[PDB]
Amino acid sequence: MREVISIHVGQAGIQIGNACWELFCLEHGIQPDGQMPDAFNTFFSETGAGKHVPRCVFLDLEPTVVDEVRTGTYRHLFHPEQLISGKEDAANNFARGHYTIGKEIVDLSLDRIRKLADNCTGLQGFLMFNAVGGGTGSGLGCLLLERLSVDYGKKSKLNFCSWPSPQVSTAVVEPYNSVLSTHSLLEHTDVAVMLDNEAIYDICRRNLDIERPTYTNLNRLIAQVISSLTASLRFDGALNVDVTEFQTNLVPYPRIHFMLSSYAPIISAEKAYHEQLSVAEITNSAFEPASMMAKCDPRHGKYMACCLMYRGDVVPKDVNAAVATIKTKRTIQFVDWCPTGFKCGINYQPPTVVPGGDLAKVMRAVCMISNSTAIAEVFSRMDHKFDLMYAKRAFVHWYVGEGMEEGEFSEAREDLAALEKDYEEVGI
Amino acid sequence: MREIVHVQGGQCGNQIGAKFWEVISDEHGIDPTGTYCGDSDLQLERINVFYNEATGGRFVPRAILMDLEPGTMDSVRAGPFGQLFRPDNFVFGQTGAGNNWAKGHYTEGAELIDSVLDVVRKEAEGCDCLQGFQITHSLGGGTGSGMGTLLISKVREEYPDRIMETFSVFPSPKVSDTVVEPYNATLSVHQLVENADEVQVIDNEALYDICFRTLKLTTPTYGDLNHLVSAAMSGVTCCLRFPGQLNSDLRKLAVNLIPFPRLHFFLIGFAPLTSRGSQQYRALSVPELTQQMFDAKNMMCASDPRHGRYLTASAMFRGRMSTKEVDEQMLNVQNKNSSYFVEWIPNNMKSSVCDIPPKGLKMSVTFVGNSTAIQEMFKRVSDQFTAMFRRKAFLHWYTGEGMDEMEFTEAESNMNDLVSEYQQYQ
Amino acid sequence: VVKRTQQGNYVPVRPDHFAGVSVALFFAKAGHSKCAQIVPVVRQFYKTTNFSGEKAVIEIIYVSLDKDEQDFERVRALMPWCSVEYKSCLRKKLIERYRVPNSTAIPLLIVIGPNGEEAGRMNFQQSDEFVLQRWDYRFNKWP
């Protein structure tokens, strides 16, 4: 009927989504086998008798991350054909994932996308997970997303991008990889949600109060945002949203679709005794700048649009109580031309907790995705990493030798220059 | 799947390789007869990366052994894990390139390339699709420095879309093996910069310093010293074999390290390096692993890194360690040691978290780094070449076998130019 | 004649276990390179496909070609699924009945139908090793 087809491309995509799918299995009571002991329609098909296969594809040019799932505990949960492994890794090149090795995967992958979309009419959209600084995360991501725009006309495209950090990078080619992705991300995706890494490091340091979490604890919190994002499709609520309404909720101009995230509550089970989580207090923590998942200071940012999805046993009016006081507060600065700037949807079912996770069971939860002019900081910082490194043509011959035309890096920057100026133009 | 062909050239390469295959075999848990015991999928799922089945369940390594004299190839045969190699894999020269690059390359070597290329492509086409090569040679001798650099040039043109990494031992400051040292090195560098993608430098005397100080061994043999290269040269390629959070590859670190194609000469460090006495008195954590791996008396090249600034540097961590404790520390050192790095590269450092620790040990790191501190080392080989050329010393032993005096003039020009770029990039 | 390994000792198997599920016997031998190759692979395959769910869909009866009590006890000390008894002449009866020569033959999985007669032959002495899962545990469940 109505559903969303998820795509995982690149390693960051795979292991975030490996956490995302194990959260969804226990949401609907689906065993790792794929059986059950009208909820599961929007993320699962039904195969033969009693089964639930996912609406997902794994793509990577290396086997090493995808085959390890093939032998994991999620053996028969995935159909063994949408799990796609190449031969050799994309190796941190935009060019290699786009020109040379990226061709031989898209020709089989688009077929499986067609195979999964041809069941029912009224496709909601495409949830594609990728990293931006990575090699296959951009190059294979671009080629797949470009072909999908032409082939399927009018369906929405959600893209969660594991954005390179303001501080850490964990790779040298990140400014060359990030900038080139953007020039091929602007006119393809519809809602690009920006996610950071050391933000969640800094979140798990302060709020979660746990000394040594790893990538497995990054991904649980990421999985909890996605579940609350698409909570409206799966379950009924007092006031629902859709995935095709977000782009009508958030974007004022078609080139501005770079939104942040937030979530609350995010509390240890040990310190949970000291917080009776009310609607009055969780909303304030949502707007508190040291709780957002992107690491940009919003004090130099004029808010433009906001979209809160409440979860769990929340009544409508204490939401209206909370949002009344929120708007009158002058620490959360809205822009002049947008006098209404809130959408708040509500769903009934409270968030699950994974066994062996680090989250106390809470009764209510708030998830925020907001459009703000603080992203001018995220991009003008990035442009500084480019031209300083492009000052005398560092790392150029790797891109040149792989297939790109030298000088294509110029109009990629001229593109990002325009995205720099329109944010400055909007904020006045 | 993915295959890495090992080639061992020269006396030093054949000795250093025999200890390397010992480290790999027991990391995977393979009986020297070739059979398997250890019972784990995770050490076995990626075994085609180095080995081949041989109808007895056994694994014969994808190693080819080459030398121009048969002395040291029976040494590895008679010695430990000699039963593992293939007798067809041996290729003999009956004459011996006596530390003469000329006969390593042109005259004597030309009639044996017709055999060594035979076995290499016999192993090459046996799989589906090759990934790269690795070659162990010393740039001192003749059958490694010249006889090896020709095999570098031949397999590169046959398969130009594959890669290779050469673990090369250079000259020393004071003490000197092979008195015609600078002739064989300089003639090989100007060939190695043209046909090889990555070269890990090793010096004997940084390596003599380590075993005197850290390991605390008064009388260091070749066996114990090769065991220290073989662990590093196993560490750089862990990620191909074992899964992890932030994966890596030779090509992954090939593109991430080198800015410009002509400078690709890398330093190696490894940690932990603990003696018997101090094994129980270290509390091994991610902090002091980073402080051990940034230590001037820890790198295996006899260059003090404090003179130059690190251009690009990679860290292949190995084991289950937490990941901000990974990433935050490389941030720490790059911000703390602001003068030790290069300003025009934001995020100088690189990381990798390979999920299986070395055997018995629990938390290990293997540091590979493109420094600019090899300004002093190549200018050392440079002036040693100039010292032994104006008097025209020991030239007759080369010139009489079709060599040309023009080759030496280009060699110095083509290597003093490599010095130029290191100093240029401050 | 057929034993299950528990915490402490061995126990005779209950014959109603084998019903409602699928059955394969595993012809193998300790000290073979290919058997040490294949034993942990089938271990992980068994555990995954059996404990990814509520109840068992397959089971394995291990039959050995080893030449010592000591090696037999050794492998049975760590192999999770069933085993046969060493002194029982059923083991040699199964050998001559199923055509393993006692090499290029071991290891072997012979999947057996409910009539005690085979429902599949599967070998590992070949290039492919993704062949464990080529066997349906859906056509051939015992009544």
């Binding site: 292991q15 194990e22 065993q31 497995t216 | 250890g38 784990s40 995770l42 | -």
Partner: peptide, 22 residues
């Protein structure tokens, strides 16, 4: 000649087949 191998991955450690919420 090797003893038995006892390092385990973080992925294998913690994502095992959880019981479903009822």
């Amino acid at each position: 000649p090797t003893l038995p191998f006892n390092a385990q991955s973080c992925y294998r450690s913690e994502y095992v087949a959880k019981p479903l919420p009822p």
